[PDB]
Structures are given as C-alpha cells and as structure tokens.
Amino acid sequence: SSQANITVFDGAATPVSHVLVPLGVGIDENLGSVAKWRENLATVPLYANVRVTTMQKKLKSGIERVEIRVEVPVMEAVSGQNAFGYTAAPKVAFTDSGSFVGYFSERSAQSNRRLVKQILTNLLGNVSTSVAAPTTGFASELIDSGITAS
Amino acid sequence: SSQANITVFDGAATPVSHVLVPLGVGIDENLGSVAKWRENLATVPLYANVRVTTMQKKLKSGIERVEIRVEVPVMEAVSGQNAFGYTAAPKVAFTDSGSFVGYFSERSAQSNRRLVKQILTNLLGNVSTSVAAPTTGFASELIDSGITAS
Amino acid sequence: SSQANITVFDGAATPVSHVLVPLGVGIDENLGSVAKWRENLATVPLYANVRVTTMQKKLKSGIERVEIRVEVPVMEAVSGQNAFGYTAAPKVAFTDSGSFVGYFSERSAQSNRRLVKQILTNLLGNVSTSVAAPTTGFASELIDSGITAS
Amino acid sequence: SSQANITVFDGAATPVSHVLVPLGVGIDENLGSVAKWRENLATVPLYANVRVTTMQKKLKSGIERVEIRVEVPVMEAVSGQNAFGYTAAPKVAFTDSGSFVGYFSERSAQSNRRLVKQILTNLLGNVSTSVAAPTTGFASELIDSGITAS
Amino acid sequence: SSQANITVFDGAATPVSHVLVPLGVGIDENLGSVAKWRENLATVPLYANVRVTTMQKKLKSGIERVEIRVEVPVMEAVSGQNAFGYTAAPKVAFTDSGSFVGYFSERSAQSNRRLVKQILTNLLGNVSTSVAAPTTGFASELIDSGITAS
Amino acid sequence: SSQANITVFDGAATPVSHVLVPLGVGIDENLGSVAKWRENLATVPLYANVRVTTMQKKLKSGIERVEIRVEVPVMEAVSGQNAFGYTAAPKVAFTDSGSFVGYFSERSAQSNRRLVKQILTNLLGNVSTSVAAPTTGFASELIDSGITAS
Ligand SMILES: [Zn+2]
Ligand SMILES: [Zn+2]
Ligand SMILES: [Zn+2]
Ligand SMILES: [Zn+2]
Ligand SMILES: [Zn+2]
Ligand SMILES: [Zn+2]
Ligand SMILES: [Zn+2]
Ligand SMILES: [Zn+2]
Incomplete structure (x- = not known):
C-alpha cells in the first residue's frame, strides 16, 4: 500500500523495461484519490x-469508480532549424493512453x-488458460480492495 | 478478425473457465463499431x-477510442417466498464492470x-519482468490495429 | 455460432437435399439481427x-421475437431457348414462405x-412419440438461446 | 379433418407426453378460421x-396466412404462505409461444x-438426412392443404 | 464466405505483394452491406x-448494386524539416480509387x-485468350453470387 | 489509340470468345468522352x-473519373417461329453490368x-501470385494514361 518503484516492460517488438518512480498521492475534487508514478529519463x-x-472516486450514484491510466508521450523529431535560425x-x-476502468x-x-479484473487481463494477454489473479501489488490493492497508495 | 468462441479464466480464488460465444457485430451511433460475446449458462x-x-469510435477531436468491456452480473439469492406467496x-x-479504454x-x-497496451496488462498482473506483447487475438486486433471482429 | 453451409432435405414426394450457403449478417432497425442463407444453383x-x-428483435414490450423464415420461390414455365443469344x-x-416464430x-x-420449440416441431412432423430436443445447431442457438449467426 | 385428440411429447430434458383435447372451432374478425386444443391436467x-x-386467414392479393400456435404457460412455484396466511x-x-407461420x-x-413445410421441420430438428413429409394429421391438413378442423 | 486475409500483388513496375487483414463488417444507411479489409504496414x-x-445495396425495380473498391493512399514524401524545425x-x-461496379x-x-465478370477482368488484363472464371474467393462470392463476407 | 475490334472470352463454364466491333466515339456533356463497342451476332x-x-470525365473536384462498362443483355425465351412471315x-x-471505375x-x-488497376484485376481473377500489369491495350490507355479511343 506504501508507494514504491514500479518496474514494468512495455509492448515493443523487443519489450523495454521502464522504472516508474513515485511522485506522491493526494485528493482531487474531480478525480478522487490520485496516486502518480513517473519514469525519470534524461532523454x-x-x-x-x-x-x-490511479484514480478512485465514489460517484453520485454510489458506484465506486477506479482507474489505472498509463500514458506514453511520443516526441517530435527535431531536425535542422526552424524559420528563426535555431534548433x-x-x-x-502525441500521448498514447491506455487505462483500466472499473465500476463497482x-x-x-x-x-x-478480483474475478472481473482477471477476465480483462487474460483477454488483453490473449490467454485462454488458467491464471491466478494477483492478490498483492498496487493494481490489486486498487481494483480488488479500493486502496490507494501512500 | 472473424468472431470466435473465447475461453477465459476469471479471478476467483480458484479461477473458473468461461466460454464466451459470439453474438454478432454492428455499428451504433453512440458507441461506434460494437462486437459482443456472451456466455450461455443455463444457471x-x-x-x-x-x-x-468491444467498442471502437473516432471522436469529434479525431482521437480514436477503443474499449474492451467485461461485465459480470451477480444474482440475488432467492429464498423462501415473497409477500404474494410465490417463489x-x-x-x-449488481453488475461488476472492468474495461480497457484506449485513446490514440x-x-x-x-x-x-501495442507498447502502451502491455504496460497496463503487466501492471494489472503484478508483473515486473519482460512479457511479449500479443500480436494476435481479438484484443490485439482492436487495441493495436483498430480492428473490430466480424 | 458463425455462419456455415446448411444441408436440408425438402418435403417433396421424393425428398431432395439443398445446400444453403451463407449470404451475410447485419442489423436492420426494423427487422433486428438478420442472418441470411441461400442455395446457389448455377443456372x-x-x-x-x-x-x-433468421430475425431476432426485442420489442417494446420486452418480449423477444424470433423467426426462422424458409422461402421457396417458384418460377413460371419456360417457352424455349434462343439459338444464338443468352436466354x-x-x-x-410466387414464393412460398414457411417460418417458425417465437415470442418469449x-x-x-x-x-x-426449448420445451415449446419441440412441441411445434413434433406437431409439424406428425410425431406422437418422444423426441429429444436439439441443443446445438443454428435453430437451437436462435430459438433456445437467442443467439444469431455471427 | 375433424377435431380429435393430439398426443405430443415436449422438449424437456426428459420429454413429457401431453394429450390435447379439442376445445372448439370458430370464426374471428381479425384471426380467421380458428381451431383450439388444450390439455386437461388436474395440476x-x-x-x-x-x-x-390454428389460424387460417385470407389476406389481400390472394395470399393466405396459416399459423399453428403452441403456447405453454409456465406456472409460478407456490411455496409457503402469502402475507395473509394462506397458500x-x-x-x-410467463407464457412461452412457439408457432409455425406460413404465407402461401x-x-x-x-x-x-408440403415441400416447404418439411425443410423447416428438418431445420428445427437439426436433421440433415432425408425424412418423409407427413401427408396426414392436423398440421399437414392445415399447412399442406389449407384445411381447418371442423 | 466469412472474412479472411487477402494477398494481392499491385501493378507497380516491379509488383509488390500486399496482405489485407479483415477490418470489419457493418450495415450502412446509404451504402448497404459493407465489408472492409486493410493492410497493416508499419510504414x-x-x-x-x-x-x-465491398458494398451490396438493393435498389428499386429489383436491381442490386455491387462494388469492390480498392483505395491506395499515396503519401507525401517527408524530406528535411518544416518551418517549425521538426520532421x-x-x-x-492523394488517394487513388479503382473499383468494380456491378448492376445486376x-x-x-x-x-x-460470372460470365460478365470475366469479360471485364480479361479486358483489364489485356487478355484475348481463354481464361477460366474463378468460382471461389470473396470477389466471386460477391459478384457471382451476391454474397457479402460475415 | 483508335478503335479496333476487341476479342474477349467470357466467363461461361466453357468460356466463349466474343468479337466486339467499334460503334463510335463522341463527347457527351454528362458522361464525358465515350467510346462504344458491340458484338455483331447476325440474328x-x-x-x-x-x-x-468507356467513359472519361473530369469532375468538379478535379478528380478524373474513368469507367470501362461491360453489359451483357439476356433475352426472354422463344415460343416458336412463324411459318410465313418474319419472326x-x-x-x-435484363442486362448484367460489370464495370471498372477509377477515381484518380x-x-x-x-x-x-497502373498499380491500383492490377490489384483489382488480380482480385477479380482470384490471383495471389505476381502478374505483370499491362502497359498497352485500350484498357491501359484509359486507366493508366487517361486516353480514350479516337
Ligand atoms: Zn525506459
Ligand atoms: Zn462459467
Ligand atoms: Zn436443390
Ligand atoms: Zn402434461
Ligand atoms: Zn365438426
Ligand atoms: Zn505493401
Ligand atoms: Zn462472422
Ligand atoms: Zn459470342
């Protein structure tokens, strides 16, 4: 439940590991309880x-909504110089965004x-066999138990 | 790309396989291209x-939005009889809902x-190691390539 | 589930087999979910x-309507064959239409x-004995389970 | 060609025989020639x-509509007493309805x-082999020959 | 008669193979039954x-319009940087469009x-000799038999 | 360049050769530049x-439209031959129409x-192998080069 570094591989043709450092947690009026991680590349x-x-909010209807939002910015290619003579x-x-969204x-x-979670995870992984649903980790704490990091 | 049976295990303490039969595909004004699967239990x-x-829609902004929505209804427990004397x-x-939502x-x-997809999948699975991103299956066709089943 | 060739014998005095190939599936606003088959005699x-x-539509009442419509067109008589052109x-x-229609x-x-389905099937076959009701096949998917071909 | 008892097995998992007794014949403003049968269970x-x-109605443009409607009322399960202390x-x-509908x-x-009739019957029975079309019985008299019981 | 991959060589000076993956099926208000394929180049x-x-639309007076539309987007050549200093x-x-259009x-x-189809095909191929008309493939199913993929 | 006899085989089960002789060329305000051929069976x-x-027309968009339209009329059946008059x-x-239509x-x-042309030609021929795109012939003059017969 305490916020820690996340090591995760992406979905490139040869997957690349990313280390996501914690940025902190807090409460937003629109979004609910928010926890943020970020990679710290000098590139x-x-x-x-x-x-x-991760967002966690109780809606007006009483339904709890949880989200895990992954955002991958892609940079423009700097080439030559602009019309002012500078690099x-x-x-x-653009920023690609892929998220899990739960309504409970x-x-x-x-x-x-937890039961619904793993159906989606297996579908996303093209897995038709039996896979044990995680009971630990920040994703399980948020989706299964409604817990935000600290 | 052609619609077929989906065999997927859930996230129960002992995961249970579900066989999701195709229901068909079509176009909705609000939702975009929609493809539906369903289990056929007599229970x-x-x-x-x-x-x-699966929904796939180009938004007004030009951003393409994709969704894979898993819904698990949970039944009330029928006990005894109601005030009218009948079972x-x-x-x-209630219906639990867990979905992947992509904005590209x-x-x-x-x-x-595909790169963003697998980051989320690994996060949901509590996987910090390297995992190859699927390049086949209905989820990959929708998220990676914008393809709806037929 | 998905469309395949149907092989059926008709009710001629000496019954004849027909092979009905798929023509397509779609969603009409008035008819509902429609799936089409047709025999492909070359000439x-x-x-x-x-x-x-097959048609499947949820009415305003909430009653689901289900139809399997068999149409056999009959042509007029031929007078001859042109010696040199195409004929x-x-x-x-006229076209003879016999269909199953279910309101559930x-x-x-x-x-x-499935219970009501087989009563009608046995009535149409002049069968007073016990017959096991089918649980597979496109007719069972549609009538018993409300599933149209994909 | 006059009304008589009908013995038909249903489509339960273990099929059950039903004896339908003649109930009456009449003419309806909107339905046409009507003949009615009904079980006589003490249950x-x-x-x-x-x-x-059965319904036989002449339409415009020299087309007659023919129906054999099977309706099975499914009873509520009486359990315990109601709020007034009585069983x-x-x-x-609910009432399930499965019918044959012919337009000829x-x-x-x-x-x-008769040729069209057996195609549908074989489709409903999941039968791809040759089956002889009945030439007697109330269903044949109605569908094949436009005869209502009397 | 269901959607599958299509492998076709183009008409470049040295012709290039293209693999078109199924993209979806739908019904359109103005176009009719539509089936879509698309390449998946990373370029x-x-x-x-x-x-x-492919489009299949029923018109008035018992005439159906059938189209197979091939669209090739030709890209601008990216060279150097733009006025902002980015690639x-x-x-x-521009997009080139070549299609088969049948009115039957x-x-x-x-x-x-099928007879008309091959005349046009031979004309487009500058072929004055005998060539056997195909009886399979999505083009034959559509043009010869009025079949849209599903 | 100028109109000449076209010799084409059709798509009958045993293909038959047709000789199409020129009928003329002109400029219609609606259709554009039109060139006509027709077979000349004596009876x-x-x-x-x-x-x-063939039609060639520059639209208001600036897009050039190109069509090669093959029409095969089919007659009704003959009933006889008069003993003494003319019959x-x-x-x-009906008339079957299959055409190539290009928008460039x-x-x-x-x-x-030429590149798009051959994709369609290979699709119509159910050809997955490499085929050299024609650079001569009236179809190539029209589709590749925008040249109508003179
Ligand atoms: Zn990294
Ligand atoms: Zn299950
Ligand atoms: Zn036949
Ligand atoms: Zn009974
Ligand atoms: Zn009587
Ligand atoms: Zn290519
Ligand atoms: Zn399909
Ligand atoms: Zn000829």
Whole structure:
C-alpha cells in the first residue's frame, strides 16, 4: 500500500523495461484519490515521461469508480532549424493512453472485483488458460480492495 | 478478425473457465463499431450472463477510442417466498464492470498502441519482468490495429 | 455460432437435399439481427433460389421475437431457348414462405424456450412419440438461446 | 379433418407426453378460421393448460396466412404462505409461444406447401438426412392443404 | 464466405505483394452491406493503409448494386524539416480509387453474373485468350453470387 | 489509340470468345468522352448483343473519373417461329453490368494508376501470385494514361 518503484516492460517488438518512480498521492475534487508514478529519463523533458496514475472516486450514484491510466508521450523529431535560425525545442507529438476502468457497486466484494479484473487481463494477454489473479501489488490493492497508495 | 468462441479464466480464488460465444457485430451511433460475446449458462437468465464487448469510435477531436468491456452480473439469492406467496423470479443484484479504454491519435502506429497496451496488462498482473506483447487475438486486433471482429 | 453451409432435405414426394450457403449478417432497425442463407444453383436466378433467414428483435414490450423464415420461390414455365443469344429463366410466379416464430419473455430460460420449440416441431412432423430436443445447431442457438449467426 | 385428440411429447430434458383435447372451432374478425386444443391436467387450472391453436386467414392479393400456435404457460412455484396466511393461488409466471407461420399464394399446390413445410421441420430438428413429409394429421391438413378442423 | 486475409500483388513496375487483414463488417444507411479489409504496414499510420471494401445495396425495380473498391493512399514524401524545425508528420498526398461496379437484376443467375465478370477482368488484363472464371474467393462470392463476407 | 475490334472470352463454364466491333466515339456533356463497342451476332437484336463502353470525365473536384462498362443483355425465351412471315427475337429480360471505375487525382502518375488497376484485376481473377500489369491495350490507355479511343 506504501508507494514504491514500479518496474514494468512495455509492448515493443523487443519489450523495454521502464522504472516508474513515485511522485506522491493526494485528493482531487474531480478525480478522487490520485496516486502518480513517473519514469525519470534524461532523454526526454520531465513532463514527457512515461507515467502511471490511479484514480478512485465514489460517484453520485454510489458506484465506486477506479482507474489505472498509463500514458506514453511520443516526441517530435527535431531536425535542422526552424524559420528563426535555431534548433527547435523538444515538443510532444502525441500521448498514447491506455487505462483500466472499473465500476463497482458498494455491495461488490474483494472476490467479485478480483474475478472481473482477471477476465480483462487474460483477454488483453490473449490467454485462454488458467491464471491466478494477483492478490498483492498496487493494481490489486486498487481494483480488488479500493486502496490507494501512500 | 472473424468472431470466435473465447475461453477465459476469471479471478476467483480458484479461477473458473468461461466460454464466451459470439453474438454478432454492428455499428451504433453512440458507441461506434460494437462486437459482443456472451456466455450461455443455463444457471442464470440469458441477459444475466458474463459478457465481453468491444467498442471502437473516432471522436469529434479525431482521437480514436477503443474499449474492451467485461461485465459480470451477480444474482440475488432467492429464498423462501415473497409477500404474494410465490417463489421470487431471478433478479440481478449488481453488475461488476472492468474495461480497457484506449485513446490514440491518428498518428499513433500499431507499435505505439501495442507498447502502451502491455504496460497496463503487466501492471494489472503484478508483473515486473519482460512479457511479449500479443500480436494476435481479438484484443490485439482492436487495441493495436483498430480492428473490430466480424 | 458463425455462419456455415446448411444441408436440408425438402418435403417433396421424393425428398431432395439443398445446400444453403451463407449470404451475410447485419442489423436492420426494423427487422433486428438478420442472418441470411441461400442455395446457389448455377443456372437458377438468384431470387428464385431457396433461401433461409433468421430475425431476432426485442420489442417494446420486452418480449423477444424470433423467426426462422424458409422461402421457396417458384418460377413460371419456360417457352424455349434462343439459338444464338443468352436466354433468361422466367419470372418468379410466387414464393412460398414457411417460418417458425417465437415470442418469449425475458424470464423464460433455455429450457422453457426449448420445451415449446419441440412441441411445434413434433406437431409439424406428425410425431406422437418422444423426441429429444436439439441443443446445438443454428435453430437451437436462435430459438433456445437467442443467439444469431455471427 | 375433424377435431380429435393430439398426443405430443415436449422438449424437456426428459420429454413429457401431453394429450390435447379439442376445445372448439370458430370464426374471428381479425384471426380467421380458428381451431383450439388444450390439455386437461388436474395440476393447473383450466386456463393455465398447454394449448394449441390454428389460424387460417385470407389476406389481400390472394395470399393466405396459416399459423399453428403452441403456447405453454409456465406456472409460478407456490411455496409457503402469502402475507395473509394462506397458500397462494396458482399464477402464471410467463407464457412461452412457439408457432409455425406460413404465407402461401392461392397459386401454390399441395406439393409446393408440403415441400416447404418439411425443410423447416428438418431445420428445427437439426436433421440433415432425408425424412418423409407427413401427408396426414392436423398440421399437414392445415399447412399442406389449407384445411381447418371442423 | 466469412472474412479472411487477402494477398494481392499491385501493378507497380516491379509488383509488390500486399496482405489485407479483415477490418470489419457493418450495415450502412446509404451504402448497404459493407465489408472492409486493410493492410497493416508499419510504414504508414493506420488510416493511410491500402484498403479494400465491398458494398451490396438493393435498389428499386429489383436491381442490386455491387462494388469492390480498392483505395491506395499515396503519401507525401517527408524530406528535411518544416518551418517549425521538426520532421513533418506523415500526410496523404492523394488517394487513388479503382473499383468494380456491378448492376445486376434479381433475375440474373450465378452463371450470368460470372460470365460478365470475366469479360471485364480479361479486358483489364489485356487478355484475348481463354481464361477460366474463378468460382471461389470473396470477389466471386460477391459478384457471382451476391454474397457479402460475415 | 483508335478503335479496333476487341476479342474477349467470357466467363461461361466453357468460356466463349466474343468479337466486339467499334460503334463510335463522341463527347457527351454528362458522361464525358465515350467510346462504344458491340458484338455483331447476325440474328441477335442489336440491343441484346454484348457491348463495351468507356467513359472519361473530369469532375468538379478535379478528380478524373474513368469507367470501362461491360453489359451483357439476356433475352426472354422463344415460343416458336412463324411459318410465313418474319419472326422477332424476344425482348431483353435484363442486362448484367460489370464495370471498372477509377477515381484518380491529377497528381497520380501512370505508375500510380497502373498499380491500383492490377490489384483489382488480380482480385477479380482470384490471383495471389505476381502478374505483370499491362502497359498497352485500350484498357491501359484509359486507366493508366487517361486516353480514350479516337
Ligand atoms: Zn525506459
Ligand atoms: Zn462459467
Ligand atoms: Zn436443390
Ligand atoms: Zn402434461
Ligand atoms: Zn365438426
Ligand atoms: Zn505493401
Ligand atoms: Zn462472422
Ligand atoms: Zn459470342
């Protein structure tokens, strides 16, 4: 439950490990309880790093909503010079976003939420065999148990 | 790309296999291209089965949005009789929903979308090691390549 | 699940086999989910060939409507064959339509729908003995389970 | 060609025989020539018995509509007492309806109609082999020959 | 008769093979039954791939319109940097469209349609000798037999 | 360049050769530049003979539209031959139309147009192997180079 470094491989043709450092946790009026991680590469601007964020909010209807949002910024290619005669500054071309989003009733239990979670995970991994659902880790704490990091 | 049976284990303490049969594909004005699967258990009403749905829509901003939505209905427990003297009809207590949601620019490539996908999948599986991102299956066709089943 | 060739014998005095190949599936706003099959006799006009169609639609009442429509077109008589040009087959004189139509409530289960189905099938076959109701095949998927071909 | 008892097995997992007694014949403003059968079980009240009904109605443009409608009322399960301290009266939970519906031109012959009939019957029975089309019975008299019982 | 991969060589001076993956099936208000294929090259963004699409639309007076539309987006050549100092994003210069368009009466048979098809094909190939007309493949299913993939 | 006899085999089960002789060239305001060919069977009505037509028109968009339209008329059946008068062949029952239609931008070169052309030709021929795209013949003059017969 305490916030720690996340080591995760991406989905490149040869997957690349990313180390996501904790940025802190807090409460937002729109989003709920928010926890932030970020990679700290010197290759790209600080704001343009691969990042992971978790939101947890009880909606007006009483349904609890959880999200794990992965954002991967992709930079423009700096070439030559601009019309002013200078090398261009780094600029983000676009940011790809892939997230898990859960909607659960107050009555849903840890077992209920964990059960749905692994169906999606297996679908995303093209896995038709039996896989044990994780009961630890920040994702399990958020989706299964409604816990935000600290 | 052609729609086929999906065999997937859930996240119960002892995971249970579910066989999701295709229901068909089509276009909705609100949702985009929609493909539907459903389990066909005689244990529960037809509408109350575990189901999987994929949406794919180009938004007004030009950003393409993809979703894989897993819904698991949980039934009420029928006990005794109601105030009218009859056994109660089956009733859904609540429906848990867990989905993948991707937002991608038109410029994002198959490699870009696949790269983000596997970060989320590994996070959901508490996997800190290297895992090859699937390049086949309905989930990969939707998220990586923007393909809906047929 | 998905469309495949149907092989059926007709009710001629000496019954004849027909092979109905798939024509497609789609969602009509009025008809509902529609799946089409048709026999492909090489010389017979396309609209004169035996065809089979399934409709599935949820009405405003909540009652699900289900139909399996068999249409057998009958042409007029031929007068001859041109010596040098190409010669058309005569126009369709009439089309015979025999269909199963089911109206089921949401509460009705697989077993409920299957139970009524076989009563009608046995009635049409002039069968007073016990016959096991099919649990597979496209007709069972549609009538028993509310599943249209994909 | 006059009304007589009908013995039919249903499509339960272990199929059950039903004896349908003639119930009456009439003419309806909107339905046409109607003939009614009905079971006489002591288990349910009179209105709640399995019933079979045929309709023959001439439409415009020389087309007649023919129906054999099988309706199975499924009863609520009486358990315990109601809020007044009495055992509940029998109540219909829902009624399943499976029917044959034929649209035939006045130009079609007995052979044409009998031919279409058996295609549907074989489809409903999941039968891909040769089966002889019945030439007797109330279903054949109605579908093949446009005969209503009397 | 269901969607599968398509391998086709183009008409470059040294012809290049293209693999078109199934992209989806749908119904359109103005286009009719639509089936879509698309290449998956990593060279261009997703929208800029070579695509193939079939349309089947019933018109008035018993005539159906059938189209196989091949669209090849030709990309602008990215060279140097733009006025902002970045490498230019990929941009479509123009899209070339070559299609088969058939208008067939409901009275035409498989043989009639297949006969016309090969005349055009031989004309496009500058072939004055005898060539056997294909009886399989998505093009034959559509043009000869009015079949859309599913 | 200028109109000459076209010799083409059709797509009958045993393909038959047709000789299409020139009928003329002109400029229609709606259709564009039109060139006509038609087979000249001695006894077949003129409007019942196989014909081939090319249209070329620059649209308002600047897109050039190109069409090669093959029409095969099919007559009704003959009932006899008068003993002493002259006897007419029956009326055309329907006409099958299969055409190539190309939409090209002004920027697209010979090689661009020729490249798409052969994709469609190979698709219509169910050809997965490499085929050299024609650079001569009236179809190539029209589709590759935008040249109508003179
Ligand atoms: Zn990294
Ligand atoms: Zn299950
Ligand atoms: Zn046949
Ligand atoms: Zn009974
Ligand atoms: Zn009587
Ligand atoms: Zn390519
Ligand atoms: Zn399909
Ligand atoms: Zn000829």
